[PDB]
Design an enzyme around this catalytic site. Structure first.
Site, mmCIF file in Angstrom:
data_model
loop_
_atom_site.group_PDB
_atom_site.id
_atom_site.type_symbol
_atom_site.label_atom_id
_atom_site.label_comp_id
_atom_site.label_asym_id
_atom_site.label_seq_id
_atom_site.Cartn_x
_atom_site.Cartn_y
_atom_site.Cartn_z
ATOM 1 N N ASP A 267 0.834 -1.206 0.000
ATOM 2 C CA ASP A 267 0.000 0.000 0.000
ATOM 3 C C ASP A 267 0.871 1.261 0.000
ATOM 4 O O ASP A 267 1.360 1.680 1.054
ATOM 5 C CB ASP A 267 -0.914 -0.027 1.226
ATOM 6 C CG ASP A 267 -1.829 1.167 1.322
ATOM 7 O OD1 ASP A 267 -1.875 1.942 0.358
ATOM 8 O OD2 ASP A 267 -2.518 1.312 2.359
ATOM 9 N N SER B 151 -0.193 15.458 -12.264
ATOM 10 C CA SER B 151 -0.380 15.053 -13.642
ATOM 11 C C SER B 151 -0.602 16.286 -14.505
ATOM 12 O O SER B 151 -1.156 17.291 -14.052
ATOM 13 C CB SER B 151 -1.596 14.133 -13.719
ATOM 14 O OG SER B 151 -1.956 13.838 -15.059
#
Ligand SMILES: Cc1cn(-c2cc(N)cc(C(F)(F)F)c2)cn1
Length: 330
Positions: free
Chosen positions: A35, A199
């Site tokens: 994770d 992004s």
């Protein structure tokens, strides 16, 4: 040193991925959910309330000759899906894919919430976010990667998650046969303890690329792709009959639909998520309404590049002095 371990979807929908981890002496192998959005290595154990264990493999520290109780230490965590767990702490030897850390904090669950109990395939979590998020009190503990880092050939790990298929986590090296083209690196902020990056934009299907900054986290422990409501609405508008269902809790779509791809930007590079990666199957058994794999982050407070996005790429988690993230197509 290096390590390499195969990671396997827990079910036919890739709802999560499990990776075998050896704990203790003799080894007790547990299948953990790696994770990158959290920083605790915790396990179902011989200490977990019996009614909260339903098929998981447990760690029994009393059978490990290298286990030592960490005096006074406790832990307690809650995840963004509402789930939670808590307990006490041992140090022990932990190996992943041939890479061994001695003295790793292994957080033994005394209590887990129902969603953990109900998932018999996940024996615990192995956190790979920054150690500043570790929950052990009163002395915070280091992640497996932080403990291994100085010994690794290079201070990196990579995630290569499969679509409906196994994949690989590597530690300490970049397998240059595992991706196509080049790896594009992008800056990371560790200020919230996550692999947080920006992004450069997105496209839906064959549509025009929209240049726009999308700050979010690379999170292998989240199944879906959570993005701003404007982006998600633009995606689902291209799927006839798709709608946001308040009763279901997100966008659903007719299971007969063919989904468009979704592209996200990493610098000037582009990662294409095939439409099929976005199908999470019937909302309930036998339904012809299917759950979408791209959902709004509006209720969450952060955008999350979860498995739906990461499994379309070969992802480098570069833990150099200034961390960065790398993405390649594959
Ligand atoms: C399905 C889902 C995942 N998350 C979530 C994951 C992480 N790693 C961090 C956060 C937080 F909001 F704390 F930043 C939320 C919420 N819902």
């Amino acid at each position: 040193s290096t390590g390499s371990a195969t990671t396997t979807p827990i079910d036919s929908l890739d709802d999560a991925y499990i990776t075998p981890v050896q704990i203790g002496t003799p080894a007790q192998t547990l299948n953990l959910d790696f994770d990158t959005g959290s920083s605790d290595l915790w396990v179902f154990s011989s200490e977990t309330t019996a009614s909260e264990v339903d098929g998981q493999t447990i760690y029994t520290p009393s059978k490990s000759t290298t286990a030592k109780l960490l005096s006074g230490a406790t832990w307690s965590i809650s995840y963004g899906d509402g789930s939670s767990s808590s307990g006490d702490v041992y140090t022990d030897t932990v190996s992943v894919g041939g890479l061994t850390v001695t003295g790793q904090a292994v957080e033994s669950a005394k209590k887990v919430s129902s969603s953990f109990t109900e998932d018999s395939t996940i024996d615990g979590l192995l956190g790979l976010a920054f150690s500043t998020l570790n929950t052990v009190s009163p002395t915070q503990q280091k992640t497996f990667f932080d403990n291994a880092k100085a010994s690794l050939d290079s201070p990196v790990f990579t995630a290569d998650l499969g679509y409906h298929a196994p994949g690989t986590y590597n530690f300490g090296f970049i397998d240059t046969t595992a991706y196509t083209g080049s790896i594009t690196y992008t800056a990371v902020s560790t200020k919230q303890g996550f692999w947080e990056w920006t992004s450069t934009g997105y496209a839906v299907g064959s549509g025009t690329f929209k240049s726009t900054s999308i700050d979010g986290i690379a999170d292998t422990g989240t199944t879906l792709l959570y993005l701003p409501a404007t982006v998600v609405s633009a995606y689902w508008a291209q799927v006839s009959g798709a709608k946001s269902s308040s009763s279901v809790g997100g966008y659903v779509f007719p299971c007969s639909a063919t989904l468009p791809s979704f592209t996200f930007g990493v610098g000037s590079a582009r990662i294409v998520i095939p439409g099929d990666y976005i199908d999470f199957g019937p909302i309930s058994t036998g339904s012809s309404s299917c759950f979408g794999g791209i959902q709004s982050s509006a209720g969450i407070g952060i955008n999350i590049f979860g498995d739906v996005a990461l499994k379309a790429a070969f992802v480098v988690f570069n833990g150099a002095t200034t961390p960065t993230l790398g993405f390649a197509s594959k």
